[model samples]
Target: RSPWCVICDPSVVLALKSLEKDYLPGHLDAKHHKAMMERVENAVKDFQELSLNEDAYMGVVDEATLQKGSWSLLKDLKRITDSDVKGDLFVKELFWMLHLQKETFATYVARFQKEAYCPNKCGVMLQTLIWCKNCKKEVHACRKSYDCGERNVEVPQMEDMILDCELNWHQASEGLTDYSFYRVWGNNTETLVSKGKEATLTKPMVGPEDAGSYRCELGSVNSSPATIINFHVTVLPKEFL
Candidate 1:
């Protein structure tokens, strides 16, 4: 061990990130590393793979050496909240960087998945967008989070996105209704995309021309506009080759 007491185990780091000041050095000296030595080994036994760059643990969580990006650790990261780790600079950075991954990080994930588990799975299809401190922009990833249904959606070029307009419990299980779907652009008005009981909309092969908004209108039999489901779509620009 080095001159200063260092926690090499990732869960200790994880527990530290969780604001577990009890396992801290000063307080622990008060309690003999505060039950940390025994607990650290036990945490190590269960977590098995939890380890971090001891010095990198001192900086921010953005270091490329963060935890080797395991699936379980990612689950642990998801389990963390911002304030959970006081003065631990890397915690929120690890979570926030995922937004960056949603872009190329998403595409990169799709590529690797096809290579590994597309060989691995036809598949469970897991992915996360973790930023690399070295790559400048490139990092690591898998799986695109297909965001849809609400008001607006941004889909990567050539990818598919879906919007679902569903009937409520009363409308679908107990009763029936009718609805229509429409696409909207500033000047063009003849933009009805589809109609009838098929309440799901698939915007296939998202191209630049498909960038627009869509609306689903349900009739109340009384022809009152019972409910309206809307979508605004934006196809991301193609990456430079």
Candidate 2:
């Protein structure tokens, strides 16, 4: 295997089926690769709209081996944080860049969730924790160290980057982490009614894009796990050519 390439683990693919209802039905092949890339490419295009190319952002792609626009250009999107090129691009870019897949594959995740642009912008504080369904208790703790107080633990990896706004090259485990992150479909806002008497989570409009709903639902811990959150988004365009 190459430095950047690894054989697709069947177990991984099988696990990913839980990520999307319409996920790869079988093995990971060129078709899967293309679909994954398409998601990322669209996100890149979306991110590009926020920043104008500067001397630092200008670059070229070598199509001799790769395809069209296979190069990366870095610009001070936030205009170097109010010093030179000022803008909100820094926060916005960092948010999606850290969780790039969320934008690239918008339909792959639940709605009403927002990604942290960076460590500085990360909003999951001690107050963020709420009640837990699995343990039947209320809790609050670190983002990484918390176990959701359940038996099933989740770990995700980037098979293909559907989107990327960060200039830094992301490592394999960078975006994968422990959290109750999930996807939601349609323009509808999901209503989660936890009926303690009935012990049921009421969710309507649940479908393919809502595959990740209530996954790893509740958790808490004494210390921080410091795991990076991953964002997986799906395109929602109707009737594409």
Candidate 3:
């Protein structure tokens, strides 16, 4: 069984226990019940195949693909067991794991990617970090349109010119401005960018000596836990390609 299927209803196990060995699902009195149980059994087998087939499993790059691949099996499980919150929550949590798989690995490639229902929901996607070298002047805002501001930005590398760690986000409210931007690199210590109603953080020009893993954080005091989004910055030598 798939790890997701291990959470199947206890009553399913109980029903299986009552079934005699070598007996067909048709042995059940009600034809509908027998067919439903058989569907559920077939769905579990499908899930088992998917889990064991790594190429198929890893090819699931987005929530839509994951749902398309697994929905039939999940729906069969639900229909067979007539489950309530437990069943729905199981499927939701399983999909959540798949979504994380997409986000955790490839931010640059997946930054523009969004679910149909929950577009721009991932802060990592909304607030992006990329290398720009005299490329062009561009700015972006986080999906939080209500509370944040933009920042003046630029690019980075061991090139012949300036290196900027530009952080951009939505416009901030002016009235009770207490938004902050932060950067943590080389060490896991906290760094703060001061009092303002903005969600933008433009790092001072960095050099080759500054090259390392840099992290950007944006948040507000009005918010609890004080940390909104955090993502890594990869800086490398700029070469003509």
Every candidate's CA RMSD: 18.7, 26.1, 17.2
Please give each candidate's TM-score: 0.34, 0.16, 0.26
- C-alpha lDDT of candidate 1 relative to the true structure: 0.44
Q: For candidate 3, write residues 1-241 as lDDT tens digits.
A: 3222321333434444343232323333343455544654453333333334323332113333333324443344344334332334544543454444323322312322332211332232222222111212222233333322322232456433222222332232111234454555556675664445444444454565543333333343333322244334444455623
Each model's C-alpha lDDT?
Answer: 0.44, 0.26, 0.35
Give lDDT: candidate 2, residue 69.
12
Higher lDDT: candidate 1 or 2?
1
Q: Please rank every candidate by lDDT, starting with the best.
A: 1, 3, 2
- Any runs in candidate 1 off by more than 4 Å, and if so which? 1-150, 170-175
lDDT of 1 by residue, 1-241 (tens): 1110113334535654553443243222344444544543443233211124232211112222233333334454444433344223432344343333223223333333334321211111222222222223222221222232357788899999776766332132212355578888778784887787777888778898888888877554332344566778888987734
